[PDB]
Design a protein around this motif. Structure first.
Motif, mmCIF file in Angstrom:
data_model
loop_
_atom_site.group_PDB
_atom_site.id
_atom_site.type_symbol
_atom_site.label_atom_id
_atom_site.label_comp_id
_atom_site.label_asym_id
_atom_site.label_seq_id
_atom_site.Cartn_x
_atom_site.Cartn_y
_atom_site.Cartn_z
ATOM 1 N N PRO A 117 2.421 -0.359 -36.916
ATOM 2 C CA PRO A 117 3.040 -0.439 -38.237
ATOM 3 C C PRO A 117 2.536 -1.679 -38.962
ATOM 4 N N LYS A 118 2.752 -1.698 -40.269
ATOM 5 C CA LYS A 118 2.442 -2.852 -41.095
ATOM 6 C C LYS A 118 3.734 -3.409 -41.671
ATOM 7 N N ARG A 119 3.809 -4.731 -41.767
ATOM 8 C CA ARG A 119 5.025 -5.376 -42.221
ATOM 9 C C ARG A 119 5.233 -5.143 -43.708
ATOM 10 N N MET A 120 6.418 -4.668 -44.050
ATOM 11 C CA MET A 120 6.760 -4.491 -45.448
ATOM 12 C C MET A 120 7.114 -5.835 -46.072
ATOM 13 N N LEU A 121 7.052 -5.882 -47.397
ATOM 14 C CA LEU A 121 7.401 -7.090 -48.118
ATOM 15 C C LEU A 121 8.901 -7.352 -48.022
ATOM 16 N N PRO B 221 -4.579 -3.299 -38.817
ATOM 17 C CA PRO B 221 -3.420 -2.482 -39.186
ATOM 18 C C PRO B 221 -3.647 -1.022 -38.833
ATOM 19 N N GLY B 222 -2.590 -0.383 -38.343
ATOM 20 C CA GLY B 222 -2.641 1.004 -37.946
ATOM 21 C C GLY B 222 -3.239 1.256 -36.578
ATOM 22 N N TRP B 223 -3.635 0.213 -35.857
ATOM 23 C CA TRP B 223 -4.361 0.388 -34.609
ATOM 24 C C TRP B 223 -3.446 0.877 -33.489
ATOM 25 N N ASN C 64 -7.490 8.798 -46.775
ATOM 26 C CA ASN C 64 -6.112 8.654 -47.222
ATOM 27 C C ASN C 64 -5.297 7.890 -46.194
ATOM 28 N N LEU C 65 -5.605 8.091 -44.913
ATOM 29 C CA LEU C 65 -4.975 7.300 -43.868
ATOM 30 C C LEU C 65 -5.360 5.838 -43.976
ATOM 31 N N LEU C 66 -6.620 5.557 -44.307
ATOM 32 C CA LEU C 66 -7.018 4.179 -44.559
ATOM 33 C C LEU C 66 -6.289 3.606 -45.761
#
Ligand SMILES: [Mg+2]
Ligand SMILES: [Mg+2]
Lengths: 190, 99, 107, 64, 257, 170, 129
Positions: free
Chosen positions: E162-166, E232-234, E250-252
């Motif tokens: 996941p990527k951290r949201m703001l 990210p996404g790894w 689109n995934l990128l």
């Protein structure tokens, strides 16, 4: 107390068969009225506060302390003229009588428990002779435990296995605060 | 004598029979074989297509962001509007108190 | 590396240099500072007001006049205060008390 | 080397293999684990004693 | 040590001897008898849940771990470092906030570090910068922080990274200002703040770019990247020691938020 | 002692058992899926997660499927997906009062259609909501072609759909 | 879409550790926060003290019974009665009264009634071992 879960049960004021109505005339006779012919006060009814439910008493108590005590009992067997640690648990003979006569000749004790480094790598001759050892036993790596540590008169540890137990107690020594369950990978787990 | 050797681990990750009527749904679904891959690598697992999310799920995630994440500029504009309104309210209250 | 959509390369679009992280009044060599727990404490800073080349002559005269009680027998102006004792809260409102005294002596 | 706890080595019923609460807790676990696997007599029995114990905990005793 | 030989002065310590320690359990008195029992026991907060909680990290204990070697200074000081050696622990639950620096007593503290906490004092910023630290403050969202803090399990979770949201709007202005030495502010506004703090700290701000670990100090963590060294996404293929990363456009794009 | 497989699938267990297990796989699928229809009175909520009203907290919320109280006679015609509701209610819709059990029954109307696919006129009870459903489908044959049988929720209309399908594939 | 990768050095620093090691050498003694290494070689005193798994001087407080404050040294070894006499002697100037202390001979510990903690840690530190 580790795993025993008893199964003995009973019946309650509604479990055993029968009983919905007033049993007899409550005041016509000189006897005693009741609530049922199926409460626990009569001849056949309930065992009122008996052990209900197949109960269990598991205790995953302080495991580092369990380790230290296991070490402690190992130390007790060490000082008690019992820790005869052998180099390798090879059997020079195939007869169990050879083990029995050596054990009487070694004045080891009335009961023997010999444990090795790996169960598959345990020597075939040793286990084959040991299969008729009616009071002696042979054991794999993780099996060194407490009731076992009293079980025989003396224990015969394999030398590399003795080192393995040492390393285990050493990993038991100074274990940091666990923040993950130690079954998964770590920095240096094995 | 000598007992049977103590319990070992399971032989790697095992997929379950989808025909089996007894299996709970927690270990036979979409993320379950993903957990199986996370257990036994690709070494016992399947093609890694389960790793990436679905395109329909990708649009769902985009909708989740659009209904769950603003932009910093919008928040800044809202803060500026709130500060301007607070200053105007404070000035009006001070004028009413002074009068 | 990877750059976010809202990454600092755009979130601070003008400043792409590293040095703008920290790139840049009261002298450091002249004054002496002191802190000691006395529980209680009193934290002080002293400097020779006669040797104060960082102060104007009318400002030095105003300091020697108003802070004459702060001027010691050796001619050293010292200032001590009371909140808490370490690096950032204890030494530099002692420095800033000196600076505010200089500012008040200016006008 | 931390492969498997003693908390699995016990050969005993899956109603109560190592979450040892009270009697009322024992029955509660028996229900929520295996209730859809009983004959109707056991279901009515477990329900009966469960109602009994739920009344038993908070109604009449020595400490209040 | 007379203990072992004194024990050797008895017979073999058999199973017949393992006595409970005197004081193990008080006697299980059946409530009856002539002494104990004749009648047997009868005789004849509105927003506390919405309140944020942030773990206060004792920076003196950070100095301890620096001295005790729990967290070495040779690499960045992240929440990965802050948890990995068990110096101070986080609790993802209870609707928490994360790791934030503490505020007492920076006397006798000689080390170089790059601290990345949610919040800290201005005195703490000056404390880091006194020996020349690095101070940054992003957010760590609830699922995001929970994934971040105990990185062992999510490394074997199986979902992609996941990527951290703001941060939320209330937390947004906190990160938006460089006066907090944060992450989400102007990268040039930080310099005047450092100068003003060095004036306020009476601090000689050294040119840390001239230092040897300046490039090590040059690492300021990217937003929406919990792993400091990963993409990210790894996907951490922990068995084959590999990194599974997507390549779809689109995934990128949804990954490059 | 305990019964091995669970009774929660006991009926389903018989579905794989014997002569009935020799039924068509298409029949197995048509009796196997359980897709839900649009409700008669359970108006759908907006989305997955939404802000709490009194708490201001982003919480995920779903909607309750109210059970359709279907009287037997409504199966004998082509009713809608509506019906009655066997529940309860308060006197002033106020929870601090003594509530009583209540019913919400439909208002049907005996109408007629003339299907070209059937090429015949069938007169049965229907709903004005069902009338609107047919009109939105623009024809009874297209409506029979359109909705699922699980979406149909009526035996007579399901039979009519079966006949229409047999005629079309014949 | 997929691509095999070998850059797991970033994975390696991500791996938290378990087996806590001995500290790296801080050149001066005491440390910045004042930690210390035990002195080598150990002294020839029959009272013997081991340190912590996380490597400190083994002194701890004890709180019970509302007002009951006491303290203990945990991993004592040797002829512990000598350590008790020494603790009473150090405590003798500290409060005047004789020390209300009990050892735990099987547990190998010493405990003194009252919290004399930081000074006791100092006494053990000045003992060096
Ligand atoms: Mg009976
Ligand atoms: Mg205590």
């Amino acid at each position: 107390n580790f795993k025993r879960i008893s199964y003995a049960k009973t019946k309650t004021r509604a479990e055993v068969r029968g009983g919905g109505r007033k049993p007899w005339p409550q005041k016509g006779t000189g006897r005693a009225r009741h609530g049922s012919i199926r409460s626990p006060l009569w001849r056949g009814g309930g065992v009122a506060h008996g052990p209900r439910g197949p109960t269990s008493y598991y205790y995953m108590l302080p495991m580092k302390v369990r380790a230290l005590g296991l070490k402690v009992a190992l130390t007790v067997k060490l000082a008690q003229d019992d820790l005869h640690i052998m180099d390798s648990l090879e059997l020079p003979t195939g007869d169990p009588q050879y083990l029995t006569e050596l054990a009487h000749y070694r004045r080891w004790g009335d009961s023997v428990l010999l444990v090795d480094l790996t169960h598959e790598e345990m020597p075939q001759s040793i286990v084959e002779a040991t299969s008729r050892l009616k009071t002696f036993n042979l054991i794999p790596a993780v099996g060194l435990n407490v009731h076992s540590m009293l079980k025989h008169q003396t224990l015969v540890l394999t030398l590399p296995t003795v080192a393995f137990l040492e390393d285990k107690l050493l990993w038991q020594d100074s274990r940091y605060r666990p923040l993950y369950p130690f079954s998964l990978p770590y920095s240096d787990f094995p | 004598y000598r007992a049977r050797p103590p319990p070992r681990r399971r032989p790697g990750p095992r997929w379950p029979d989808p025909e089996d009527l007894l299996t709970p749904r927690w270990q036979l679904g979409p993320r379950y074989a993903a957990k199986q891959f996370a257990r036994y690598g690709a070494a016992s697992g399947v093609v890694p297509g389960s790793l990436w999310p679905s395109p329909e799920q990708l649009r769902e995630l985009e909708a989740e962001e659009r209904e769950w994440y603003p932009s910093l500029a919008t928040m800044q504009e809202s803060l500026r509007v709130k500060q301007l309104a607070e200053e105007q309210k404070r000035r009006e209250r001070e004028q009413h108190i002074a009068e | 590396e990877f750059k976010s959509i809202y990454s600092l390369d755009k979130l601070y679009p003008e400043s792409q240099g590293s040095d703008t992280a920290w790139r840049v009044d009261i002298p450091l060599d002249r004054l002496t500072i002191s802190y000691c727990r006395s529980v209680n404490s009193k934290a002080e800073v002293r400097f020779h007001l006669a040797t104060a080349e960082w102060i104007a002559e009318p400002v030095r005269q105003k300091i020697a006049i108003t802070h004459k009680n702060k001027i010691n027998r050796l001619g050293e102006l010292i200032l001590t205060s009371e909140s808490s004792r370490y690096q950032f809260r204890n030494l530099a409102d002692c420095l800033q008390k000196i600076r505010d005294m200089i500012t008040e002596a200016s006008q | 080397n931390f492969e498997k706890h003693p908390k699995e080595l016990i050969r005993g019923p899956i109603w109560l293999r190592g979450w040892k609460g009270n009697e009322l807790q024992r029955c509660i676990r028996k229900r929520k684990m295996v209730g859809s696997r009983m004959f109707a007599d056991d279901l009515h029995n477990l329900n009966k004693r469960i109602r009994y114990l739920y009344k038993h905990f908070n109604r009449h005793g020595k400490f209040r | 040590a007379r203990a072992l030989d004194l024990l050797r002065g008895l017979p073999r310590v058999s199973l017949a001897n393992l006595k409970p320690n005197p004081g193990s359990k008080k006697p299980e008195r059946r409530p009856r008898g002539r002494r104990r029992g004749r009648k047997c026991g009868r005789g004849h907060n509105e927003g506390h849940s919405f309140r944020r909680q942030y773990k206060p990290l004792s920076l003196n204990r950070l100095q301890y771990l620096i001295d005790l070697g729990r967290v070495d200074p040779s690499q960045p000081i992240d929440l990965t470092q802050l948890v990995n050696g068990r110096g101070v622990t986080i609790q993802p639950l209870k609707r928490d906030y994360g790791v934030q620096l503490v505020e007492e007593g920076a006397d006798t503290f000689t080390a170089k570090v790059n601290i990345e906490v949610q919040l800290a004092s201005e005195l703490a910023i000056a404390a880091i910068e006194k020996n020349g630290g690095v101070v940054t403050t992003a957010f760590y969202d609830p699922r995001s922080l929970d994934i971040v803090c105990k990185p062992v399990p999510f490394f074997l979770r199986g979902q992609p990274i996941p990527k951290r949201m703001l941060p939320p709007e209330e937390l947004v202005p906190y990160y938006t200002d460089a006066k907090n030495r944060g992450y989400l502010a102007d990268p040039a506004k930080f310099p005047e703040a450092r100068l003003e703090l060095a004036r306020k700290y009476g601090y000689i701000l050294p040119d840390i770019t001239k230092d040897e670990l300046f490039k090590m100090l040059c690492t300021r963590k990217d937003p929406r990247q919990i792993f400091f060294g990963l993409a990210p996404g790894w996907v951490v293929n922990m068995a084959d020691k590999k990194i599974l990363k997507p390549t779809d456009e689109n995934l990128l794009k949804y990954y490059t938020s | 002692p305990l019964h091995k497989y669970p009774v929660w699938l006991w009926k389903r267990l018989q579905l794989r058992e014997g002569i009935c297990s020799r039924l068509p796989g298409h029949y197995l699928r048509s009796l196997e899926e359980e897709r839900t229809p649009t409700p008669v009175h359970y108006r759908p909520h907006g989305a997955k997660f939404k802000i709490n009203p009194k708490n201001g907290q982003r919480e995920r919320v779903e909607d309750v499927p109210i059970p359709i109280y279907f009287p037997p006679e409504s199966q004998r015609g082509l009713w809608g997906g509506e019906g009655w509701i066997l529940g309860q209610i308060y006197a002033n819709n106020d929870k601090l009062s003594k509530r009583l059990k209540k019913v919400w029954k439909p208002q049907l109307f005996e109408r007629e259609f003339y299907s070209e696919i059937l090429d015949k006129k069938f007169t049965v009870t229907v709903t004005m909501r069902t009338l609107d459903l047919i009109d939105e489908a623009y024809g009874l044959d297209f409506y029979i072609l359109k909705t699922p049988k699980e979406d149909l929720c009526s035996k007579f209309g399901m039979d009519l759909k079966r006949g229409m399908l047999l005629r079309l594939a014949r | 879409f997929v691509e095999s990768v070998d850059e797991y050095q970033f994975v390696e620093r991500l791996l938290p550790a378990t087996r806590i090691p001995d500290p790296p050498k801080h050149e001066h003694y005491p440390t910045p926060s004042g930690w210390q290494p035990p002195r080598d070689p150990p002294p020839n005193l029959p009272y013997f003290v081991r340190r912590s798994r996380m490597h400190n001087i083994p002194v701890y407080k004890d709180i019970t019974h509302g007002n009951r404050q006491m303290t203990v040294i945990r991993k004592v070894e040797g002829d512990i009665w000598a350590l008790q006499k020494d603790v009473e002697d150090f405590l003798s100037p500290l409060l005047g009264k004789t020390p209300v202390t009990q050892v735990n001979e099987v547990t190998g510990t010493l405990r003194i009634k009252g919290y004399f903690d930081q000074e006791l840690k100092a006494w053990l530190l000045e003992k060096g071992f």
